[PDB]
Amino acid sequence: NFTAPVTTPSIPTPIQFLQTWLPGFVKVMTAARKIDEIIGIDTVGSWEDQEIV
Amino acid sequence: NFTAPVTTPSIPTPIQFLQTWLPGFVKVMTAARKIDEIIGIDTVGSWEDQEIV
């Protein structure tokens, strides 16, 4: 009895459409940059220059 | 003399009507739940889902 199902029975819902992706991304750190904190930064010169006096 | 009192003499006022009940009912605590304080909670997903990416 029960005839034939024509299609192969299986779980209907795929794994996708059931996954939510976090809005953000992670990035790698690399070493700390602490020259500015110790000394500070001064913007005095201009580009395409050569020397500071 | 003194005839009979018909009813049996006794203390007139029952124990009830002389009791006041505190408005609150204490409860048992069980162990502390401190996962939220240490790590925090993020509500990102939705129900009927399966995975987080």
Side-chain angles (χ1 to χ4, degrees):
Chain A
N1 275 11
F2 264 67
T3 76
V6 162
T7 61
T8 66
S10 74
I11 305 166
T13 318
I15 176 60
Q16 64 181 356
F17 304 125
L18 304 172
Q19 283 169 356
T20 181
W21 290 56
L22 300 192
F25 279 83
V26 187
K27 273 187 179 286
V28 301
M29 294 298 102
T30 188
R33 299 182 295 277
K34 316 194 67 40
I35 181 70
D36 283 318
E37 155 188 35
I38 300 175
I39 294 314
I41 179 155
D42 278 26
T43 50
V44 298
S46 75
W47 195 66
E48 76 264 12
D49 283 330
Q50 187 81 98
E51 286 186 332
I52 309 295
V53 191
Chain B
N1 276 12
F2 265 68
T3 76
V6 163
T7 61
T8 66
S10 74
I11 310 192
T13 302
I15 176 60
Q16 53 168 103
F17 303 123
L18 298 177
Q19 281 167 355
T20 185
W21 290 56
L22 298 188
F25 283 82
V26 299
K27 284 190 184 291
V28 306
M29 293 177 70
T30 67
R33 300 183 297 275
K34 293 178 72 68
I35 181 69
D36 282 318
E37 156 180 38
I38 300 177
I39 301 299
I41 177 155
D42 293 358
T43 48
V44 298
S46 75
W47 182 65
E48 69 270 14
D49 288 331
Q50 185 81 98
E51 295 195 312
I52 310 295
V53 191

